[PDB]
Design a protein around this nucleic acid. Sequence first.
DNA 1: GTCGG
DNA 2: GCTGATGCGC
DNA 3: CCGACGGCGCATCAGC
Length: 325
Amino acid sequence: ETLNGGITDMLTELANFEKNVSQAIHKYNAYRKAASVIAKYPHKIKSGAEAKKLPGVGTKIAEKIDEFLATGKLRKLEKIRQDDTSSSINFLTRVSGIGPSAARKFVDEGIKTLEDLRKNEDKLNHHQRIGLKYFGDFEKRIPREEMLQMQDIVLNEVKKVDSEYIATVCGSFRRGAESSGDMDVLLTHPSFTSESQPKLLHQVVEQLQKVHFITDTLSKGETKFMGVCQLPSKNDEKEYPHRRIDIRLIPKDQYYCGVLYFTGSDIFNKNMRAHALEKGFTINEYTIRPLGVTGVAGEPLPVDSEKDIFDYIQWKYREPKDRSE
DNA sequence: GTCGG
DNA sequence: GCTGATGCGC
DNA sequence: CCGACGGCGCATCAGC
Ligand SMILES: *[C@H]1c2c(ccc3ccc4ccccc4c23)[C@@H](O)[C@H](O)[C@@H]1O
Ligand SMILES: [Cl-]
Ligand SMILES: [Cl-]
Ligand code: NA
Ligand code: NA
C-alpha cells in the first residue's frame, strides 16, 4: 500500500474523472486496470519504464508516473481538482442513482452539493432520493459479523415463505471476505426453470419487509430486486447503518452457474472460462455449453451443483475461499 | 488509454 | 397508450 | 490503423 499508493491513488482519481466528467468509460476501465496491476506489484516503482512492463500500463501512464515520481504530483490532476464544475460533477456521482449524465445536468443548473440536492427533492427520481438519504451509510463497508447476522435473517425468512426455496449469499462474502460492500442474494425454487411465476421474488421481498429487514426499494422486477436493509438494533444500542442488498431469482437449471458466477472472483471466472474453452466448453453466467469442432455451441449441459460444472471441464472442485484466482 | 489483429 | 433507447448499478 | 474493451434488469426518457 505504502509501496505505490501514490501512483495507484493517482490512477484511480484519473479513472473517476474519465468516467464521471469526460464520460469515457473505456479510459476509466483502462486506468483502473493499470491501478490494479500496479497495486499487486511487489516492488516500489522507480520509473515509468519499469511500470510500462506491466500489462495495462502504456506509454501515457508511464509518462504520468515519471511526472509524479519527480514532482510528487500531476499537473492535470491538480488543475482538474481546482475546477469547480468538474470536481462537483465528479462528487455528485457518489450518490447512488446519480450517474455522469445526471451529475452533469445538476451541475449545469447550479446544483453542486448534497445540500443543494437536499433542497431540490422535486428534481430527484426515487432512486436518487434514497441514494441521498443514505449517502454516508452506502459508503460504509460491512463487517463480516454483520453480514452473518444479515444472512441469518435472509435464510430464515426465505425458508419461512417456502421451505423449497434455495438462497445463497454470494459475493466476496461467500469466499470468506472480512468485509463486504453489499449483500448479493441468489434465489431459486424447483417450480422455476428456463422453460416453464412473478410472485416467487415478490413474496420473499414482502416477508423481508414484514419483519422490517428491507427498508427501501430501489428497483424490483420479476427476477431482480435492489434495495436497502438494516439489522435490528440491540437494546439501547446505536442504530446499525442501512445497507445495500440485491436479491436475484434464477431458474433452477441455471442456478449453480449463477452462484459460481456471482461468487467470483473476477480473475477466477476468467481462468475458469479459459480452461472451459480448452476442454471444448463455453461457460457463461447462465450455462455451460459444448463447443463443436467448427465452434458451434451445442445445447446447455445438465447442472445440479457447482461441482458438476467443475467435472465437465475436469477441474478439482475449489471452494470459494480459494477462488481468489 | 492499452492492446493487438 | 406503446416500443425502443438511455441511464444506472452491478 | 483502428475496433474491442464480459452486458443485463429495471426505471425512466424519447418518440411515435
Ligand atoms: C464488466 C463489468 C464492469 C463493472 C461491473 C460489472 C458488474 C457486473 C457485470 C455483470 C455482467 C457483465 C459485466 C459486469 C461488470 C467493468 O468494470 C468491466 O469493464 C466490464 O464491463
Ligand atoms: Cl465551466
Ligand atoms: Cl446461454
Ligand atoms: Na504495459
Ligand atoms: Na452514482
